[PDB]
């Protein structure tokens, strides 16, 4: 589904909320598919599905856990074609466990692998990378 991407969003990272669902940021609390290792923080990368809370945003989006999908990383990562790239900020979009977005639009670009992995994020995205 996806090649390994340098993890830049450990548990506790707060990224920008990229959709128009009314949230201003996402606070990562877990990562789907993350491994187990003593003392090792679960960390997210481009295109990864995480569990997140809303720290700033519309009041009914706050105080509850919801799936999110990382659309911008801002941590340098290496493609197979040798390109080390990163975005200006960390950004994700609120989505259901099935990967369908809660919002209806994307602000900013979206990673290639994220668009490949999630068609709904790709469909709601504008320009990619």
């Amino acid at each position: 589904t996806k090649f390994r991407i340098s993890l830049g969003l450990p548990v506790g990272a707060i990224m920008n909320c990229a959709d128009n669902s009314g949230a201003r940021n996402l606070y990562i609390i877990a990562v789907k598919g993350s491994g187990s290792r003593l003392n090792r923080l679960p960390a997210a990368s481009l295109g990864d599905m995480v569990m997140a809370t809303v720290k700033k945003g519309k009041p009914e989006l706050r105080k509850k856990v919801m799936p999110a999908i990382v659309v911008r990383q801002a941590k340098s990562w290496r493609r197979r074609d040798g390109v080390f790239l990163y975005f200006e900020d960390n950004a994700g979009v609120i989505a259901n466990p099935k990967g369908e977005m809660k919002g209806s639009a994307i602000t900013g670009p979206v990673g290639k692998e994220c668009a490949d992995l999630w068609p709904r994020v790709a469909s709601n995205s504008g320009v990619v990378v």
């Binding site: 074609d81 040798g82 490949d116």
Partner: protein, 386 residues
Amino acid sequence: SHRKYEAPRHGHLGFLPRKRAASIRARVKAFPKDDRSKPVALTSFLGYKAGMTTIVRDLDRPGSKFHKREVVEAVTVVDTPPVVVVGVVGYVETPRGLRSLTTVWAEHLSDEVKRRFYKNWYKSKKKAFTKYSAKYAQDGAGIERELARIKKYASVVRVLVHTQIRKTPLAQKKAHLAEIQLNGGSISEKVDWAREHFEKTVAVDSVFEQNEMIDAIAVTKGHGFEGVTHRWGTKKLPRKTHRGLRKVACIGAWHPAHVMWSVARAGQRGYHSRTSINHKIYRVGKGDDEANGATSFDRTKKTITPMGGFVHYGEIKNDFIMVKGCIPGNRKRIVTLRKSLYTNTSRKALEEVSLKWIDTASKFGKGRFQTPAEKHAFMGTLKKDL
């Protein structure tokens, strides 16, 4: 009481002891299983690690999300001048293991290989093999009988070959002598192959081919005495730790009342013999073939030597084997490449690479230009020259 949190062991106990290798040349502890129907051919080769670079090639991997498009891959380049056959060793099977019955050397040995048999070459009298060379006085009657014993016996036949290291930019000047097993049927023909090849050179084209998976056997880069944190990857102790934190906190329970072999402890790191398997050759380039670093898609007249030369090695002027990834050992170090011990069929092997571009920019910095022609074409006229 129990550890209270399970975690995998730090380090691999099968690579013990973590001591210095007894020689700068790693020993080939296993050769490919002999198939008595194939022709006689070397199962290994001797080269020297020159350095690393990058290439571009189309990825041929059906079922991959990224099939049929371009990948950038690191590759290690090993200078592999042809090895000179100077001897033949026979091994007979015994209930105590393999035993060398006898060894038959070539008539004339170059000073390069003779230097291996002396620690002080400058003040020596170079008497080595002078009485042995007399064994070829009229017909080599002792020699042909010695070879006949190898044919009558010695179920395993190995050739004694040495590197042509004066052809490398190394200041070593002393060749590395090694035994390479001759695979192929008709042991008598093995001795015939070796005897015919005395004083003769064997090129890397006869051992390796494009896309082949080979084994890298070399002594890793030495790092001296090392603490437990980097030697084994053990967790760093907190900043609050008294008497230092780059240590292992508990080196053992009260009972057994001894430090156990499985506990990470400080000592020498690196300079170990490693045998890393399944490295794919991407090039078998020829030293005399100008434009070594060119591909069917570039055609630019440039050798494999990077602009300014391989860092810490020099310029490559001989046959070189480019393997994918990295191999044990540092630059300038003797390495031996051997055949794979099994037939690997997993679509990573059998995958036929065709290079699109080879990086020839300077490794001495953030290299911007592949060739001196490109540097002039970019910057134009300078004040010093050009």
